[PDB]
Symmetry: C3
Subunit: 465 residues, 3 copies
């Protein structure tokens, strides 16, 4: 068992340093690059409130009840623009435990005015212990943010004009009206300041590659390195993906590749002299030194790779404690692991169900990456065709369209570690308030005893008095 | 606070692209490769049921009780083969809340017949609120899958015959009878279609390496690259691990390595002519261009390494939120971290207990990667010798042997994130049903009040009536 | 649904093998390295106990209560040194459920003597069901460990003397008295055996690099590779960080770099002869073979990189199930993911709140990496300047200074997966003891019914008897 203390200190993580190889090539070829400018120019806002009305009006009576309603409101153009300018909400008043005898303030305000905040989350609470009167509570909601628009850039060859397209969820161009309000799924969105691009020139290093490697006197084409990929720029045409385009003009050329030297064939320019052994040895020594430099670069790269490998293994070993299926997944097997210490562990195998087109197996469901027993009759999804994406695909997820304005969700449908984070306080309260042990015993009967014996005792006392 | 919405979309992760280096070597050497064929040919099946019988026969009585039994059944040869052919179970009927007055169906079926399913998990429920009669519930279990057999391949040199061995858990050959039924630990397994192998030829690139690097006129031996390792194939003998074997025949040879060129020594073939400066400059230019190509490959590799490093750092930074011991483990230190935001965090140190041969420290136990207080007197394991394995060791975990047919487990012994996933619904039900707050007050006394005051009130009413 | 079984086996993880490139450079340059010796020489110890005193003295009375106290004790010099020698505690006796009629042992011992243990964690339990008498419980604490001291090494040039400095949390030298006792935050620390260093010689490979790459006849300086970085050692001065210092002496020199060979210029040593085509072809063949070796090293490095990339992608795919914000973080976006199977998943976007200097948004707090609703009025931290550190910065976290001896903490302030690990048993007990369902009904009223109806029934029975 370790110990926890009061000593701390603020910190931030800095990336590991990678030393570039020495003696880099010379960049002397100009490349034209066109890409869209970075600009959010999308506004998102929402607002809502929660209300509860209660009136025990005593007990053992039908005059008792606590009804609650949740509402979502739209946001106007002027309000949303003013919020974007001020980066704040304009929201109503908070009511907590208001006695209902002359205070029914939860019935006179429905828009929400007076208070400006940078963001607020509603909390719901119910308390109706005052029998002789009414009670009501009210809470409010805030939200304001910006996001970038899903876009794409394309250019033509015969005219050299470029245009920017606005894409939907599936990636298709669509008409969007600028400076207007759209409501869908309980949020309001506005688009403004249509996107623009820019052009610049970048120096790069290029060489000639042979198409056929094991055949001399073959066809060669130009290749250049831009960021992490080698592009074929033999042809002077636009070629690009997403929003970044590459072009090499005709006038900018590349140094020619000398042919192989052989006897019986004239060797380029003629310089009539007699060579000596010293020149050959000088050339040999220079080339050996160059090879030595290349070798040193090789060991540097190898050391970097080894360091990364060690770091990755330490990472996986540390992380495997929480996720018990990581080791099996990395082995392309189906086992689960439990740890006896920080170094040693055990293994335990599972089976694999037959292939299926859904996530339901006769009262079994797949959730949170695990198969568990299920009793919900209707919670099943039929598998359809899937798309595939990489980490660097530059995809956005906010689209200003029209649709249903009704919204509904539940706190029970929380993903991994979001449920725990959201319900930690409630779990702590439940655990502390209920003193778990061998004292609670009102669970051995049915709901009859709540009213039966109580009313019978009341009547017995009344006619015995 | 962010927001959750109704907008989604199916997706799949695609691996990052790694561009191979240009101008690859030429593969002109034939290599013989022998490996075992991929074939599951192992059958696994299981079946069980759960039964509960209850009879309150009123309350305040000994005539009330809810006894439950769990049983596990074996599977025959014909049944298991038919299941494997159909990929389905043959299981009995489900009984839910059957009044016991003329319905005692939980006493007439014990094999399980009528229903064919692809997989079913049993759910246990008890309800005995009907005092005047009996009640009983029943559930059932399904399971069918296949797995590969742990095997090993070895070959001899003097005859060139290869054989496949079947290995146990420790990795020792054992006799296994084909097409028979074995029962152990509540499951049934059948082995069929003994393993086979195949032979093929693969082209590869080979060179000669010097044994002593800083000594000219030294001994050299042949080396070839197959997948990610350089193998010494100077000798024409079989050498292999697990189930994949490598061989190079005598007739297939490798190009010779020219010796170093020096003066006073004849230089291989004689071509009597006079060299000129132009030839030397041509050779120099060609070799410089080759060096340029090699350099470009170097920068490409460096860029790939940098991209991987950035991705790994982003991964660890994102993951460190859940596991608070990751940063300390990666630093070879003993600290814990808490986050103030998505970028900044704090640190807090622990201590290290003295070395021990178990996982128990005087009412302290090590579970889920953490040291916690313990009250269970007997839960301790004495450490023994440990084996070590890599991710790519090709080990299996299903072995058809004989052993005890009794099986028992508990839902309390769940590993990390399996307990949470399995008990999420029950936790939600407990939290929602119990309205945590300052209302529950039946915990301030002992179990006496369940019967004492109730019976005393009953008697008081009886003699006061 | 898979299955869990009784079959297991101890194991340990072995790091993946990285084959170094063939034909490594020759190491012939001596380098002087000075670093501090590895030595813990810091002692940490602590001790405490927990006591509870209770006396129901019946019920319905003020004579009932359960008061508990927690105390922390200092450790003397002799006691801590003796513990360090024996690697054990010297702790008192455990009292469990002692009837108070002639047994008040929880009032006579306050130091803790008799028992020697290697480590013990206290468990707190309260039970006061014996009305006629008293009861009390007692528990105890243990702790002993060692850690290394935060230090730094510096050396001077004109004299070649090195010294070791002791650093505080911020990294500043401070006076520390050796062999003395310091108390702070409820722990005791002792420093002994002030640090020392050592000197050794290491062979390394060095070359000459040009300062200006695209200009012949430029200035060059010496560079050497030590572990994973290339250091400039052109000057014979000490240069070092943390505690490891590097030096190259004047007498140890590096081989000179030959100049470029050109016509009209004498080529180093003169050897008057006539070259032939055979010599040139021999040189060409040798250099081509060297280039082939370099290429093979290139493909080996590429294969290693590809293997690492595949392993990292498998790791992230497996881990993404628990942390639903990993995919969005790796994409530099703000989305959350839910999984339909082990391969396919969905996406769901959030918003981004405006920039702020704290972690509180009007009843919202940031904890465990998530934004959740908050009701605690005062739990907020104002952001200050942050430091940045790498994984390999060699920082320690135990400092023997003076300060407040009072300590206090709570089990509610647990970080990620520490709360779950510590409260798993209590959660299991709460879930099992409370049979969640539609039976608990004592929550529909207020705390009045605990005493009201009970006392009224008591009085009714008393005057009806
Ligand atoms: C990780 O494990 C996966 C699950 O075992 C492997 O996926 C299976 O690989 C099999 C062999 O490559 C393939 O199954 C069949 O194999 C036999 C070979 O004799 C042939 O019938 C077919 O080639 C192939 N498919 C069918 C329909 O028969 C499949 O690729 C796949 N089987 C599945 C999904 O059921 C992965 O290959 C493995 N990854 C590795 C080893 O790198
Ligand atoms: C990560 O941290 C580990 C825990 O501190 C280190 O493991 C310890 O390293 C020590 C130094 O290498 C070794 O302990 C003793 O060191 C002294 C040196 O003067 C010598 O006595 C011995 O070389 C060594 N062993 C003994 C029995 O004395 C051990 O290797 C180890 N100590 C333990 C396990 O108690 C790791 O080295 C460290 N990893 C790094 C720095 O890369
Ligand atoms: C990952 O996402 C981050 C959040 O979008 C990016 O951080 C933002 O990048 C912006 C563009 O580089 C920068 O914001 C402003 O951009 C405009 C450009 O026209 C200019 O005003 C400024 O260059 C820049 N800053 C200001 C004050 O305007 C910022 O770097 C940053 N914005 C923030 C933090 O609000 C990361 O760049 C992105 N990482 C990538 C793409 O690799
Ligand atoms: C957008 O509008 C233009 C003209 O208004 C039209 O030519 C184009 O087809 C529209 N894009 C669509 C419908 O995707
Ligand atoms: C399994 O589910 C199917 C749903 O189509 C149902 O028809 C079948 O009866 C179920 N099997 C049982 C309940 O044993
Ligand atoms: C969206 O669907 C809901 C059904 O719940 C309906 O009430 C609402 O009117 C719909 N809105 C639109 C714009 O179609
Ligand atoms: C398997 O059986 C063969 C012959 O039946 C025998 O030679 C061999 O030793 C057996 N393998 C064992 C016992 O591991
Ligand atoms: C610690 O455990 C050992 C078990 O051998 C026991 O003998 C000893 O009394 C324990 N120490 C206590 C209870 O303080
Ligand atoms: C296995 O052990 C159990 C003890 O729980 C015993 O009842 C059973 O008969 C044993 N089976 C065999 C095959 O030895
Ligand atoms: C430590 O003590 C020495 C002499 O006792 C003094 O010169 C030095 O400044 C001290 N270090 C500090 C105060 O950081
Ligand atoms: C938000 O918090 C601030 C704290 O300074 C407070 O003044 C303001 O009233 C709060 N907004 C509400 C309660 O709507
Ligand atoms: C530390 O602060 C506490 C306040 O909680 C005080 O009681 C104690 O005396 C202080 N100790 C020292 C050494 O200043």
């Amino acid at each position: 068992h370790c110990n926890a203390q009061m000593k701390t200190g603020p910190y931030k993580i800095k990336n590991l340093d990678i030393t570039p190889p020495k003696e880099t090539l010379q960049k002397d070829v100009e490349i034209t690059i066109v890409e869209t400018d970075y600009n959010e120019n999308v506004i998102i806002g929402y607002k809502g409130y929660y209300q509860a009305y209660a009136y025990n009006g005593g007990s053992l009576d039908p005059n008792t009840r606590v009804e609650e309603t949740m509402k979502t409101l739209n946001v106007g153009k002027e309000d949303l623009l003013m919020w974007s300018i001020r980066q704040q909400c304009e929201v109503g008043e908070e009511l907590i435990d208001r006695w209902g005898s002359d205070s029914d303030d939860c019935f006179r305000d429905n828009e929400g005015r007076g208070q400006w905040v940078k963001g607020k989350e509603l909390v719901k609470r119910q308390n109706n212990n005052h029998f002789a009167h009414h009670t009501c509570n009210k809470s409010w909601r805030c939200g304001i943010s910006t996001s970038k628009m899903y876009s794409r850039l394309e250019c033509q060859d015969d005219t050299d004009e470029c245009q920017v397209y606005i894409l939907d969820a599936e990636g298709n161009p669509i008409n969007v009206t600028v400076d207007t309000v759209l409501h869908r799924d309980g949020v309001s969105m506005i688009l403004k300041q249509k996107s623009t691009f820019t052009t610049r020139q970048i120096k790069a290093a290029c060489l000639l590659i042979k198409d056929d490697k094991n055949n001399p006197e073959s066809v060669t084409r130009e290749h250049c390195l831009i960021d992490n990929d080698i592009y074929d720029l033999s042809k002077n045409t636009w070629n690009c993906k997403f929003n970044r385009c590459i072009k090499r003009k005709v006038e900018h050329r590349v140094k020619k590749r000398p042919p192989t030297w052989r006897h019986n064939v004239r060797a380029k320019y003629t310089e009539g002299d007699t060579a000596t052994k010293g020149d050959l040895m000088h050339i040999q020594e220079e080339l050996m030194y160059e090879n030595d430099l290349l070798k040193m670069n090789i060991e540097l790269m190898h050391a970097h790779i080894n360091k990364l490998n060690n770091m990755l293994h330490d990472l996986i070993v540390s992380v495997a404690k929480v996720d018990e299926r990581l080791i099996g997944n990395l082995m392309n097997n189906s086992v689960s692991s439990t740890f006896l210490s920080d170094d040693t562990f055990l293994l335990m195998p599972c089976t694999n169900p037959p292939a299926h087109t859904s996530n339901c197996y006769n009262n079994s469901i797949y959730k949170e990456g695990r198969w568990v027993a299920n009793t919900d009759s209707s919670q099943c999804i039929d598998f359809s065709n899937y798309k595939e994406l990489a980490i660097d695909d530059d995809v956005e997820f906010w689209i200003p369209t029209i649709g249903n304005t009704t919204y509904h969700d539940s706190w029970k449908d929380a993903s991994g570690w979001s449920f725990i984070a959201q319900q930690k306080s409630n779990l702590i309260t439940t655990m502390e308030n209920t003193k778990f042990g061998g004292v609670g015993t009102s669970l051995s009967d049915i709901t009859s005893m709540a009213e039966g014996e109580l009313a019978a005792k009341l009547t017995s006392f009344m006619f015995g008095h």
